[PDB]
């Protein structure tokens, strides 16, 4: 199964996403990036049913990029998360629902605060210091409950994230071929090459 983790530290939001794409017993890819830049200060990670995940993520990207051009303004992460939730809440009662789970990490330039939103395929949304989707939540959550401090620096958050991944690599039956880590802060979105 796929790992998508998010931790919101003092001044940023970090998203860790498993690189593995597996269909049945064969591993299709080991370098997959389960992320879409919605806006310059908003990143969305996604895990779920094949096809649905990328189709949903790209559709949200197109809609947020359209809104950006039309108003020459960046929607707040809260606004982007509410839009994404409503799209998912529509799809559950649709003919064929999107089986996609998302983490939305964004930096709010007005409030100068990082925000992390967890939304499941039903349109269940919560704002948390840290979150995860799937089996990974069970393993990781208890570790983050102990170590997490709200005034943590980006480097401390990466260390805590690094600890989580090592633990998951040991206890998980699946090989998820490592994670890609992206940081969302006031300066924007960047990928951590070293992990």
């Amino acid at each position: 199964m796929d790992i998508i983790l998010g931790i919101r530290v003092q001044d940023s939001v970090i998203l860790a996403s498993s690189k593995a794409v597996t269909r049945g017993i064969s591993v299709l890819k080991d370098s997959d990036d389960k992320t879409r830049q919605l806006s310059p200060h908003t990143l969305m990670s996604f895990a779920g049913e094949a096809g649905d995940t990328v189709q949903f993520a790209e559709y949200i990207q197109a809609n947020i990029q359209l809104y950006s051009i039309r108003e020459d303004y960046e929607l707040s992460p809260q606004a982007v998360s509410s839009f994404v939730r409503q799209e998912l809440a529509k799809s559950i009662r649709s003919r064929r629902p999107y089986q996609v789970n998302v983490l939305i990490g964004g930096y709010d330039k007005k409030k100068n605060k990082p925000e992390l939103y967890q939304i499941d395929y039903l349109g269940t949304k919560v704002e948390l210091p840290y979150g995860a989707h799937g089996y990974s939540g069970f393993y990781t959550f208890s570790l983050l409950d102990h170590h997490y401090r709200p005034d943590m620096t980006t480097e401390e958050g990466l260390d805590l994230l690094k600890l989580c991944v090592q633990e998951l690599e040991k206890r998980m039956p699946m090989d998820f071929k490592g994670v890609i880590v992206k940081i969302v802060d006031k300066d924007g979105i960047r990928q951590v090459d070293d992990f």
């Binding site: 794409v21 269909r23 049945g24 017993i25 064969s26 591993v27 299709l28 890819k29 080991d30 997959d32 049913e49 094949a50 096809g51 649905d52 990328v54 189709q55 064929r96």
Partner: protein
């Protein structure tokens, strides 16, 4: 069914078997599992034979319309996404398709996209489908700096490896070399004759007597 596509210095190698089975019955040993979409784009047949043929012939039609309207060769990214978007409309209806969309453009270089009936679209350096399993066969002798002659052999040898072990793979190997100026057919090789020659010349398949 065994279909192989990989990227190298000299472009893309595409290697497929030619066996079609209904249950234990061998319906054909002369199936063409490479679909010539147009002179620069190749598709591989896996899952439904009709689904792959029909929608990849349709893709060639859509690709031709794109070139008339925009007066430019369609990118592999764009060609692959037309097919992936179409099968996604039909998702849950029972389309069966696992295909590698292969092309070489100046913009992109050699590009392979794996396109799925489930709506999966993945860009990769190497894709193999063996009888209901797909992945990034032997993987031991593959390096980017490989000759066109050597790369053709590796694809041919890789299909031979699967054809021997897998009941639903066999007949012949069909070879294609994909370049920026288009694809080149590298012929039909009977697996029966290939096996004996490979065995003798390589020394391999010691377990088999001949």
């Amino acid at each position: 069914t065994t279909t192989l596509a990989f990227r190298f210095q000299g472009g893309i190698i595409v290697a497929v078997d030619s066996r079609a089975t209904a249950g234990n019955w061998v319906a054909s040993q002369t199936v063409k599992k490479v679909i010539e979409i147009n002179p620069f784009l190749l598709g591989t047949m896996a899952g439904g034979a009709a689904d792959c043929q029909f929608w990849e012939t349709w893709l060639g039609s859509q690709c031709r319309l794109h070139e008339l309207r925009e007066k430019e060769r369609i990118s592999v990214a764009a060609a692959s996404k037309i097919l992936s978007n179409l099968v996604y409309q039909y998702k849950g209806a029972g389309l069966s398709m696992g295909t590698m969309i292969c092309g070489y453009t100046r913009k992109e270089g050699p590009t392979i996209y794996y396109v799925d009936s489930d709506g999966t679209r993945l860009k990769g350096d190497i894709f193999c489908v063996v009888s209901g399993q797909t992945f990034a066969v032997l993987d031991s002798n593959y390096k980017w700096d490989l000759s066109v002659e050597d790369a053709l052999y590796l694809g041919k040898r890789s299909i031979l490896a699967a054809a021997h072990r897998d009941a639903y793979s066999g007949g012949s190997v069909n070879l294609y070399h994909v370049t920026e100026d288009g694809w080149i057919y590298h012929g039909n090789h009977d697996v029966g004759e290939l096996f004996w020659k490979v065995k003798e010349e390589e020394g391999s398949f010691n377990n088999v007597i001949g």
